């Protein structure tokens, strides 16, 4: 949640852990330029993804904490993010002389309560829009991360030496296949 869950702290901490893993990796390989390491490819991909997720979290918190006194809730935006996308993703004056302050004050209290109700309802609407955007980003980002991780690791998982020591030579160069004259 956007009120008790510190999203950006978690995301930037994932970025920090990724940086520590880059620190670990950097000492163990030569700094050549023939290719990027497979673990280096995954770490770069993950850091870019975490950066994008931090940007998304900043935008979602901007959406969540909007208020009537700062922003205007547009009807097309509200209808898109609250109806469409939630479905897609899923005498008698002496008495009056003394009662007039009371009646005026009471009407003031009622008006104040009504204004506060409208304010809080608009806050709730912005919170719902933020939650909808968050669920959309969940359904978008996570499959991309899974697909990218699987693609990166299936290169190395299926990386094997060739069955013959020399491409173009069918000889296995083994003891059992020794070549008599």
């Amino acid at each position: 949640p956007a009120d008790c869950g510190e999203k950006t702290s978690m995301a930037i901490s994932v970025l920090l852990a990724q940086s520590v893993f880059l620190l670990l990796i950097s000492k163990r390989l030569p700094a050549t330029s023939m290719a990027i390491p497979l673990i280096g490819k995954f770490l770069l991909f993950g850091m870019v993804l975490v950066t994008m997720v931090v940007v998304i979290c900043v935008i979602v918190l901007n959406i969540h904490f909007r208020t009537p006194s700062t922003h205007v809730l547009s009807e097309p935006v509200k209808k898109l993010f609250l109806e469409t996308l939630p479905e897609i993703l899923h005498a008698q004056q002496e008495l009056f002389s003394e009662l007039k302050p009371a009646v005026d004050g009471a009407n003031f209290i009622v008006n104040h309560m009504k204004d506060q109700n409208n304010y809080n309802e608009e806050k709730d609407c912005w919170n719902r829009v933020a939650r909808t955007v968050d669920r959309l980003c969940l359904f978008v980002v996570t499959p991309i991360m899974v697909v990218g991780t699987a693609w990166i690791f299936l290169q190395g998982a299926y990386n094997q030496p060739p069955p013959q020591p020399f491409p173009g030579d069918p000889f296995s160069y083994l003891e059992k296949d020794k070549r008599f004259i």
């Binding site: 670990l24 309560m113 709730d124």
Partner: protein, 182 residues
């Protein structure tokens, strides 16, 4: 020893209330400390692939333990801010987490002066009363989810401490008893 201390810290987040606004700080910082200690371990432990060291098994167990703690804490925190405006309490959640378990624990299930201004004041007082009645109902509905989150926190505190002890023993006890039985 530092791995043991981090494993002990892993289960502490389940006693920390969600209203403190510090659950994720605690869990993520335990993970960060473990990640930094990975530098110590890669410096101190041989880099051989012939077998997984027993101490390496303990490391991987502690790492998975912290990550599971973080996932489960996210679940608890998501449960704790479920509201009637967004979610409807399932009957099975009410059957399990309110009555089946907490009954074991010790808490709470939890003349004619008609005038345009005077009539407005009357209707406004009635409206205010109805408004705070509805607010009380929504507050109770939120407190139900809060109680559910609290019960899960208790159960999983117990589970995490138990698994910390059991996983400390399961990695080490075999060789230690072999050594003592010499």
């Amino acid at each position: 020893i530092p791995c043991l201390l981090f494993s002990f810290l892993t289960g502490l987040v389940f006693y920390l209330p969600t209203d403190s606004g510090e659950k994720m700080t605690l869990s993520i910082s335990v993970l960060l400390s473990l990640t930094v200690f990975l530098l110590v371990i890669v410096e101190l432990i041989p880099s051989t692939s012939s077998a997984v060291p027993l101490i390496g098994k303990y490391m991987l167990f502690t790492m998975v333990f912290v990550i599971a703690s973080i996932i489960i804490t996210v679940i608890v925190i998501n449960t704790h801010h479920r509201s009637p405006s967004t979610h409807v309490m399932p009957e099975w959640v009410r059957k399990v987490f309110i009555d089946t378990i907490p009954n074991i624990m010790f808490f709470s299930t939890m003349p004619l002066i008609k005038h345009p201004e005077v009539k407005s004041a009357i209707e406004g007082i009635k409206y205010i009363a109805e408004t705070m009645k509805s607010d009380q109902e929504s507050n109770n509905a939120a407190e139900e989810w809060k109680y559910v989150a609290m019960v899960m926190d208790h159960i999983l505190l117990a589970v995490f401490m138990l698994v910390c002890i059991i996983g400390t023993l399961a990695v080490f006890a075999g060789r230690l008893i072999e050594l003592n039985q010499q």
